[PDB]
Design a binder for this molecule. Structure first.
Ligand SMILES: *C/C=C(C)/C=C/C=C(C)/C=C/C1=C(C)CCCC1(C)C
Ligand SMILES: *C/C=C(C)/C=C/C=C(C)/C=C/C1=C(C)CCCC1(C)C
Ligand SMILES: *C/C=C(C)/C=C/C=C(C)/C=C/C1=C(C)CCCC1(C)C
Lengths: 170, 170, 170
């Protein structure tokens, strides 16, 4: 069941890498960072594609890595390290749990709140970015607690990133 | 048995994060770094709290991470990377063993000796720091070889860090 | 069978660390980096020494770590991050497989091609380096697909690194 959605997903991700790379062929820093997310996402996305116990983690792993990257990206334009700890915390939990979350959410707020504090066309970018990220991530804890698991999540990352990447080109 | 001590421990660690964070609300760099240790320590400390095989590693994992941080912190005020290798070496061993140490100790001396070479109120700080660290870590290999396992270790980290953090505020 | 070769290997690696360290007692950066490879190689090399499933990974793990280091070293004199992803990809695969490669090779070309683009006595160094690396790594995918597994690989790392390190002193 979960698979229908997943195959879709991996496909899209790869594209991202192709596109960005292609496109890419201060400014110097961005291409790399933004390119790193889709590619990483793609490999782990396909990794995942390729009952309950095993599938879960991959997401976490990919998520882990793309997260700081995403956050770094955002901040780029201790703070930094703090965020990853949280994320690391989070994966521990979920995996711990079906195979804790309380603190994860605490940590999430931190990142979110810092973002808020932090930023306050580049301006445009961060403005949109902050809200984009906020709402985007909400599905995680929301869904977590909540065909669907996979579905939703799929949307989210692609939405999150591919959309996100586009902003940079913009 | 081990638990009595452990619950105690996690509690204290969390405090650290609260306090520092709170307090925090060149100087810029320190808060982050110092704040990162207690928080990380707390999460993994609680992770551990939450027969022989499983418990062991967590310590290692947390230890791993707080170590370079601690060392980085100290140096902050290749060198760097070398140290983590050692630490990584160390975890490999202990986990390998009950679930090698010889080289670990070799590596430990390196860090210790470098510290010595390195530093030779900031001055005060490093002076105390070096000896603090030296003696502190000695229990590890000492204890390792040696209720008690957990007990001692508990003391050590808190002693090591919470005390350590305090120095920075100072 | 594999062991004969392996014991040989670990021995040589350790030497490297001793030598470099010893020797070492812009220039500042190199010693560290170059010293880090042999030592790391040695620990994991011995780790490996100390039927099919278990042995494999260690190599990967060590490989993982020495790789970016090696690459970083080369570049030192996003780019950076990209490369590790690939490597990470690669380990996933091989381990996935006997315990994917297609993309690994794709990634390898990237590193290789970037090198090419990148560099185009320091000059000498990179010139030789690029070809050295290219041919060296070819055995990996070659052998992978291909007493021998262990044999060949052994040669390669030592050849790769110990030789490589020497270049720096040079
Ligand atoms: C490309 C994917 C990205 C950028 C994913 C980011 C994910 C998070 C911040 C997930 C957080 C989670 C928690 C709050 C812990 C338990 C529930 C989770 C796992 C969904
Ligand atoms: C907050 C905790 C910290 C900063 C811990 C640091 C720990 C070490 C340097 C442990 C080293 C160990 C060895 C020498 C290998 C086998 C014996 C160990 C594991 C205790
Ligand atoms: C000191 C050892 C070093 C620097 C090793 C570097 C290794 C690689 C770049 C290995 C790549 C591999 C693939 C192309 C994936 C499946 C086949 C492998 C595993 C050999």
């Amino acid at each position: 069941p979960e698979w229908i959605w997943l195959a879709l997903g991996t496909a899209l991700m790869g594209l991202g890498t192709l596109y960005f790379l292609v496109k890419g062929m201060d400014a110097k820093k961005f291409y790399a960072i933004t390119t790193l997310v889709p590619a990483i996402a793609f490999t782990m996305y396909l990794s995942m594609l390729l009952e309950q116990n095993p599938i879960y983690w991959a997401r976490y792993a990919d998520w882990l890595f793309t997260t700081p990257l995403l956050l770094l990206d955002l901040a780029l334009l201790g703070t930094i390290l703090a965020l990853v700890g949280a994320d690391g915390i989070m994966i521990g939990t979920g995996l711990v749990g079906a195979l804790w979350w309380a603190i994860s959410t605490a940590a999430m707020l931190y990142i979110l709140y810092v973002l808020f504090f932090g930023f306050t066309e580049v301006a445009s970018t961060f403005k949109v970015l902050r809200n984009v990220t906020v709402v985007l991530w909400s599905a995680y804890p929301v869904v977590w607690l909540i065909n669907i698991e996979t579905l939703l999540f799929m949307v989210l990352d692609v939405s999150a990133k591919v959309g996100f990447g586009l902003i940079l080109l913009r």
